[PDB]
Amino acid sequence: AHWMPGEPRPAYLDGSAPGDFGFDPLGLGEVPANLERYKESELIHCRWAMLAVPGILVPEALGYGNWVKAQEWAALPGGQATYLGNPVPWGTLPTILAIEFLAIAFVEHQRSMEKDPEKKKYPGGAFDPLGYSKDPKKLEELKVKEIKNGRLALLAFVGFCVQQSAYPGTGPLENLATHLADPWHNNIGDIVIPFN
Amino acid sequence: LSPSIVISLSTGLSLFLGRFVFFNFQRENVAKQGLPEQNGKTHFEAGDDRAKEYVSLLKSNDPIGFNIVDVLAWGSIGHIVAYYILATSSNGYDPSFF
Amino acid sequence: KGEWLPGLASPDYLTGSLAGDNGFDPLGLAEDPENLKWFVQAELVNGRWAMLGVAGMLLPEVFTKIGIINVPEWYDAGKEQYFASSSTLFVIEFILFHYVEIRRWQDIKNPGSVNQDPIFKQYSLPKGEVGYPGGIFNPLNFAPTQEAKEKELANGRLAMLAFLGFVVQHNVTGKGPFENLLQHLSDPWHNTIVQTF
Amino acid sequence: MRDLKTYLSVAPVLSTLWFGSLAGLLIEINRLFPDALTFPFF
Amino acid sequence: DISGLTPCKDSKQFAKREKQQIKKLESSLKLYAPESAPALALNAQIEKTKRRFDNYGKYGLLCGSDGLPHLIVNGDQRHWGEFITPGILFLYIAGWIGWVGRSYLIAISGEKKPAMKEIIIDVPLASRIIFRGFIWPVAAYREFLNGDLIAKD
Ligand code: CLA
Ligand SMILES: CC(/C=C/C=C(C)/C=C/[C@@]12O[C@]1(C)C[C@@H](O)CC2(C)C)=C\C=C\C=C(C)\C=C\C=C(C)\C=C\[C@@]12O[C@]1(C)C[C@@H](O)CC2(C)C
């Protein structure tokens, strides 16, 4: 377990934590309270991004959008979201912002008030149906799996955002389609090396 | 949505966040900062005879401790967000990014 | 091991232990031993890449002229159309060079660090000295004797200056290397640097 | 010559020799390559 | 054509400046005999002027409304030769000097009275140290990595 074999491990990164492959070049997690805050925020970023990747790929495969087309309707005054074709009757810009704020603020601020640093990241109980917590010998494996898939989804979200930045008006499945059609001449190389 | 509805809903949803959601955070931050300390002592403790924290206005009854000053604060945020909504909606402005 | 300028003495930092140690350090660069063991690796890699480069920009030309196989002349070889783009080659030459050069970096940082595969953890590499990995980098298993290392560094030092000669025989001449050799062998006393300038 | 090489080693004599040589170098370069505003040799 | 500047080989004001300076030199050339030495010096200056303007034409210099070569120092490759290719050629040479005079100061730092080598420069030691700064960038790089570049007080 090491992000780069041959590099020395930080003394505070032993490998016991889930996904602790010793990757701290800049030295951010040197004090332990900041490291617990960073673990909580890593898992939060991870869970949001890996929930987001289906919400980006699926509505582009079948939902008739491309994950930014789902936002353009709010940029134009007059027009509401096309949740699978049908328009939503819950208003367009301001009231969805009200519901989003009033819902996620309550959820995330009931998350904030937790003091146990393990429940701050792995609460369980109501958030653990199906009883996938009653055996730590596999729960550690599942925590490593969560961390790994979540870091993968975070990198995939960088892929989404930067493929949107390089190609302004497309989506990731269109990028994969272009790479499956002509894989050599339609890759990143035309952007890292701009011809003009 | 009529403007009375907008003002009432946004104010209600602001002091609802203040009464139930963002109360313990605001109050624990208040206790953390505590008071303005002039050379260790507070402003009233060092003297000045005018910076005394008023308690006749903050003693109001509530099982959780809501006071009239939080009613003004959550509610100033309320009227502010309401008028932001109202003016932003009444201004037919096209962001026209696309 | 020998001396490059007999009037001068080999410096104290070049004890003759290293391969190719003719005592050439007039400008005192490898005075710190860490700099010495870093510049050993820089010499080896620049020289091996220069050997491959010279062999890949001269041997095409001595085969183009005699007509065994027609291939471009190393400066018109970029503009040719290949099965990929002009930048896709750079993408691949980044993806799978970053991996091999950072592993070489971890080797020249601490020697015994990176010798086993990430995937097939059984197929390790023998504990060779730094800059000389061995194993699958030695399939024919020619021994890395010190005479062989000296021959390596000599051909590499020669190929480095050969590449420099190529770059300057295309920068202020315009023609290829082997064509310049044939021009020299045509009339050696009239086809030199002091006729071009 | 002993103690003349120490005088010529002194900071002003050595500075005037170095800057005379350097100034002649720059002067003859500007004769050879006058009126330069770019480096086009790459 | 960056920054709203026509190139100098195409700028009419640049050619007008050339013609104005050439006429200003020719009006001083009439007063001398055509075979005389002042006249030949003026003619050499005339050819120098003409090839100066031609060279500012061919080297990609950009001319403004005033009709003078402007330098685009931003980073455009077309104009690296205006600032960056000289600039590196400065930072090399300058960094030669400082890497020499520093190294000398480290080589005479361990003397008994090291101030009598500041005013009386050891020409052998200085000549040994001068070419150490030829390839100075790798020495400065490594000394930064080895910590020998910054004293530890
Ligand atoms: C700091 C502000 C400044 C700047 C940036 C310039 C810049 C310039 N001035 Mg101006 N000037 C200035 C102040 C300045 N001057 C002042 C204060 C005065 C009054 C004293 C003048 C008076 C003045 C006049 C009267 C003239 C200039 C000229 C020039 C140009 C110099 C051309 C030349 O001879 O260099 C050529 C390059 C060199 C001399 C450097 C050579 C260095 C040696 C040979 C080593 C380099 C090689 C080295 C070994 C590395 C090789 C790499 C590797 C192989 C090792 C240039 C545009 C001249 C010009 O052309 O007008 C535009 C001109 O006629 N200037
Ligand atoms: C790596 C290298 C060259 C690699 C070339 C390659 C891959 C070429 C590839 C290609 O051609 C092909 C195959 C095919 C083409 O289609 C494409 C390209 C891409 C063009 C050169 C290094 C070249 C390196 C050179 C020339 C280095 C010279 C160094 C010298 C002379 C050092 C001298 C000193 O440092 C010492 C030794 C000791 C100090 O104390 C004193 C001083 C004096 C400072």
UniProtKB/Swiss-Prot annotation, chain A:
Q: Does the keyword ATP-binding apply?
A: no
Q: Which residues bind chlorophyll a 5?
A: K145, Q163
Residues bound to chlorophyll a 1: F23, E42, R151
Q: Where does chlorophyll a 6 bind?
A: H179
Residue sites binding chlorophyll b 4 per the record: R111
**Free-text comment on the cofactor:** Binds at least 14 chlorophylls (8 Chl-a and 6 Chl-b) and carotenoids such as lutein and neoxanthin.
Q: How does it sit in the membrane?
A: Multi-pass membrane protein
| Record's keyword terms, sorted | Chlorophyll, Chloroplast, Chromophore, Magnesium, Membrane, Metal-binding, Phosphoprotein, Photosynthesis, Photosystem I, Plastid, Thylakoid, Transit peptide, Transmembrane, Transmembrane helix
Q: A biological process (GO) annotation for this entry?
A: response to low light intensity stimulus
Drop me one GO molecular function for this one: mRNA binding
This protein's GO CC annotations: chloroplast; chloroplast envelope; chloroplast thylakoid; chloroplast thylakoid membrane; photosystem I; plastoglobule; thylakoid
PTM: Photoregulated by reversible phosphorylation of its threonine residues.
Positions annotated to bind chlorophyll b 1: W3
- Residues binding chlorophyll b 3: E108
Binding positions for chlorophyll b 2 per the UniProt entry: R47, V88
Q: Briefly describe its induction.
A: Induced by low light (LL) but repressed by high light (HL). Inhibited by cold.
Instruction: Give the binding site residues for chlorophyll a 2.
Output: H45
Q: Which cysteines are joined by disulfide bonds?
A: none
Q: What does the record note on quaternary structure?
A: The LHC complex consists of chlorophyll a-b binding proteins. Red-emitting heterodimer with LHCA4. Interacts with LHCA5.
Its family remark reads: Belongs to the light-harvesting chlorophyll a/b-binding (LHC) protein family.
Q: What is known of its domains?
A: The N-terminus of the protein extends into the stroma where it is involved with adhesion of granal membranes and post-translational modifications; both are believed to mediate the distribution of excitation energy between photosystems I and II.
Additional record remark? Light emission at 684 nm upon excitation at 410 and 470 nm.
Q: Which organism is it from?
A: Arabidopsis thaliana (Mouse-ear cress)
Swiss-Prot record, chain B:
Membrane disposition: Multi-pass membrane protein
Give the transmembrane region(s). Answer: 5-25, 68-88
Give the main localization category: plastid
- Location of this chain's protein in the cell: Plastid, Chloroplast membrane
| Domain of life according to the entry | Eukaryota
- Family the entry assigns: Belongs to the PsaG/PsaK family.
Q: What does this protein do?
A: Not yet known.
Which protein, by its recorded name, is this? Photosystem I reaction center subunit V, chloroplastic
Naturally occurring in which organism (per UniProt): Arabidopsis thaliana
Curated annotation (Swiss-Prot), chain C:
Keywords from the UniProt entry: Chlorophyll, Chloroplast, Chromophore, Magnesium, Membrane, Metal-binding, Phosphoprotein, Photosynthesis, Photosystem I, Plastid, Thylakoid, Transit peptide, Transmembrane, Transmembrane helix
Any one Gene Ontology BP term: response to low light intensity stimulus
* Organism superkingdom: Eukaryota
Note on how the cofactor is bound: Binds at least 14 chlorophylls (8 Chl-a and 6 Chl-b) and carotenoids such as lutein and neoxanthin.
Quick one: which residues bind chlorophyll a 4? N155
Look up the record and report any one GO term of the cellular component aspect. thylakoid
Instruction: State where chlorophyll a 6 binds.
Output: H184
Annotated positions binding chlorophyll b 3: S85, E101
- What triggers or suppresses the expression of this protein? Induced by low light (LL) but repressed by high light (HL). Inhibited by cold.
Q: How does it sit in the membrane?
A: Multi-pass membrane protein
Positions of chlorophyll a 1 binding:
F24, E43, R157
Localization per Swiss-Prot or TrEMBL: Plastid, Chloroplast thylakoid membrane
Q: Which residues cross the membrane?
A: 49-69, 82-102
**Binding positions for chlorophyll b 4 per the UniProt entry:** R104
| Post-translational modification note | Photoregulated by reversible phosphorylation of its threonine residues.
User: What are the GO MF terms of this UniProt record?
Assistant: chlorophyll binding; metal ion binding; mRNA binding; protein domain specific binding
- Which amino acids does the record list as binding chlorophyll a 5? K151, Q169
Q: Does the keyword Manganese apply?
A: no
Q: What does this protein do?
A: The light-harvesting complex (LHC) functions as a light receptor, it captures and delivers excitation energy to photosystems with which it is closely associated.
Q: What is known of its domains?
A: The N-terminus of the protein extends into the stroma where it is involved with adhesion of granal membranes and post-translational modifications; both are believed to mediate the distribution of excitation energy between photosystems I and II.
**Partners and quaternary state?**
The LHC complex consists of chlorophyll a-b binding proteins. Red-emitting heterodimer with LHCA1.
Source species, please? Answer: Arabidopsis thaliana
Q: Which gene encodes it?
A: LHCA4
Swiss-Prot record, chain E:
Included stretch of the parent chain = 68 to 220 of 221
Q: What is its main location?
A: plastid
Report the function annotation for this chain.
Answer: Participates in efficiency of electron transfer from plastocyanin to P700 (or cytochrome c553 in algae and cyanobacteria). This plastocyanin-docking protein contributes to the specific association of plastocyanin to PSI.
State the family named in the UniProt similarity comment for this chain: Belongs to the PsaF family.
Q: Which GO terms describe its molecular function?
A: mRNA binding; protein domain specific binding
Membrane spanning stretches: 80-100
What are the subcellular locations of this protein?
A: Plastid, Chloroplast thylakoid membrane
Tell me the domain of life: Eukaryota
Q: What is its membrane topology?
A: Single-pass membrane protein
Q: Which residues form a coiled coil?
A: none
Protein's organism: Arabidopsis thaliana
Q: What is this protein called?
A: Photosystem I reaction center subunit III, chloroplastic
Query: Which lineage do the record's taxonomy fields give for this organism?
Result: Eukaryota, Viridiplantae, Streptophyta, Embryophyta, Tracheophyta
Q: Which gene encodes it?
A: PSAF
Q: Which GO terms describe its cellular component?
A: chloroplast; chloroplast envelope; chloroplast thylakoid; chloroplast thylakoid membrane; nucleus; photosystem I reaction center; plastoglobule; thylakoid
